[PDB]
Design a protein around this ligand. Structure first.
Ligand SMILES: [Mg+2]
Ligand SMILES: [Mg+2]
Ligand SMILES: [Mg+2]
Ligand SMILES: [Mg+2]
Ligand SMILES: [Mg+2]
Ligand SMILES: [Mg+2]
Ligand SMILES: [Mg+2]
Length: 50
RNA sequence: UACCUGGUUGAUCCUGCCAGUAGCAUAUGCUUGUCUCAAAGAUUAAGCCAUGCAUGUCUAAGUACGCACGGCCGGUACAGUG
């Protein structure tokens, strides 16, 4: 499942301001940047060995 | 600038100190127009202290769900300022 679809967003409703909703930033979320960082670490290991 | 002068005797020559002489540091007195530097609660009490200040700090890059602002789109997990 996709955890991005179940984030509980709090409805922000202030007088005089356009009503809307807010969501937190998911932590410990596997993202392409995390995988790329892991790949780079492994690549550095390979370079050191070579 | 490698310097002396007054004072013991009726007078002399000595010894010898007292006093004078110049600088330098602290204080103090009288006086003081310009201008450049500039010391400054050490000495007595490392005695006692009202009050205020004297040490804080965020980048692109640890943690943002404060609408505190501001969205752009509005379910686009997380825009940005913070
Ligand atoms: Mg005699
Ligand atoms: Mg005489
Ligand atoms: Mg003398
Ligand atoms: Mg004199
Ligand atoms: Mg003047
Ligand atoms: Mg002092
Ligand atoms: Mg003192």
């Amino acid at each position: 499942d996709d955890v991005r679809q179940y984030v509980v967003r709090k409805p922000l409703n202030k007088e005089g301001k356009k009503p809307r909703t807010k969501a937190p930033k998911i932590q410990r979320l596997v993202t392409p940047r995390v995988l790329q960082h892991k790949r780079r670490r492994i690549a550095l290991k390979k370079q050191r060995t070579k």
